[PDB]
Design a protein around this ligand. Structure first.
Ligand SMILES: [Ca+2]
Ligand SMILES: [Ca+2]
Ligand SMILES: [Ca+2]
Ligand SMILES: [Ca+2]
Ligand SMILES: [Ca+2]
Ligand SMILES: [Ca+2]
Ligand SMILES: [Ca+2]
Ligand SMILES: [Ca+2]
Ligand SMILES: [Ca+2]
Length: 291
């Protein structure tokens, strides 16, 4: 009746997703924009439009909040006009021209040699990859080149009258004089991860007592999909119990998300201690560094 040491693995399943309460585009990937897998209600969308061909299509929107999406690629020209528009280009090498017009527009480039015209208002461009993947140059015409390698080739996108740029790593205030990008502090950052653990004592006399998470920022909320599992106190710790068949020799917790306040630490080590028991106890632990 000696508790045998189990095996535990923790895995960051993706990079942190910074979310901003004041920017509904935050946490929406280019892919989700191109597929329509986001909440159009958060943007007050009143009309939706697509392109038609695999070549340069011109789609004009309405004076209302329009969703216009390149479903067939080719490098389409989208005119948003008035209203707060969501203009989503495609991923062909040939550029989209996305003209936001008046209102506060979301201009989603996709891949390729895209031209993004914010127009009047406070406009946001959504670019793929991280800010660090992009070279900014000033143009003679007052616009900016955003150079990025896509498919091992250097591509140039041009941005005009865009106040904000959203990358995978967050939203930046864009200085339209000198092309400075200044990081905006997120409201929260979602860190997705998984825990898997198994007993080395395989006769059913042992169960997992608990999974103890440590090293987490105070005020962080752990989720399993929908469910709130717990809020991280002063001590940086959560004791997990009852999230598995209690009989099981092997535990896999998936769909876990740690939502960290933006004011909390941009770097920490998430440690898991898997505790095996029968009267006596034994532990193993693993860590992942979260950025
Ligand atoms: Ca044992
Ligand atoms: Ca098209
Ligand atoms: Ca397109
Ligand atoms: Ca419109
Ligand atoms: Ca507009
Ligand atoms: Ca594009
Ligand atoms: Ca605009
Ligand atoms: Ca603008
Ligand atoms: Ca045993």
């Amino acid at each position: 009746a000696v508790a045998d040491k189990p095996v535990v693995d923790i895995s960051l399943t993706g990079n942190g997703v910074p979310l901003y309460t004041q920017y509904p585009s935050s946490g929406i990937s280019t892919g989700a924009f191109q597929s329509g897998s986001f909440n159009k209600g958060n943007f007050g969308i009143t009309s939706s439009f697509t392109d038609s061909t695999t070549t340069q299509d011109s789609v004009v929107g309405t004076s209302g909040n329009d969703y216009i999406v390149s479903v067939k690629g080719g490098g389409d020209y989208f005119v948003g006009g008035a209203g707060n528009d969501v203009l989503v280009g495609g991923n062909s090498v040939s550029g989209d021209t996305l003209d936001g017009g008046t209102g506060n527009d979301i201009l989603v480039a996709g891949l390729g040699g895209d031209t993004l015209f914010g127009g009047a208002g406070t406009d946001l461009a959504v670019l793929m990859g991280s800010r660090a993947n992009y070279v900014i140059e000033r143009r003679s015409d007052g616009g900016f080149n955003f150079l990025v390698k896509e498919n091992g080739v250097t591509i140039s996108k041009s941005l005009y009258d865009i106040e904000l740029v959203q990358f995978d790593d967050g939203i930046y205030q864009f200085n339209q004089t000198d092309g400075t990008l200044t990081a905006v502090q997120p409201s929260v950052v979602d860190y997705p991860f998984e825990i898997s653990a198994s007993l080395t004592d395989r006769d059913g006399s042992e169960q997992f007592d608990s999974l103890v998470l440590t090293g987490m920022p105070t005020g962080s909320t752990l989720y399993q999909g929908s469910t709130v599992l717990g809020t991280v106190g002063a001590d940086g710790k959560l004791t997990l119990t009852g999230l598995w068949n209690q009989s099981a020799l092997d535990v896999k917790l998936t769909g876990l998300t740690l939502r960290v306040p933006g004011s909390s630490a941009g770097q920490f080590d998430l440690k898991v201690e898997a505790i095996a028991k029968e009267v006596a106890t034994d532990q193993t632990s693993s860590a992942s560094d979260q950025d």
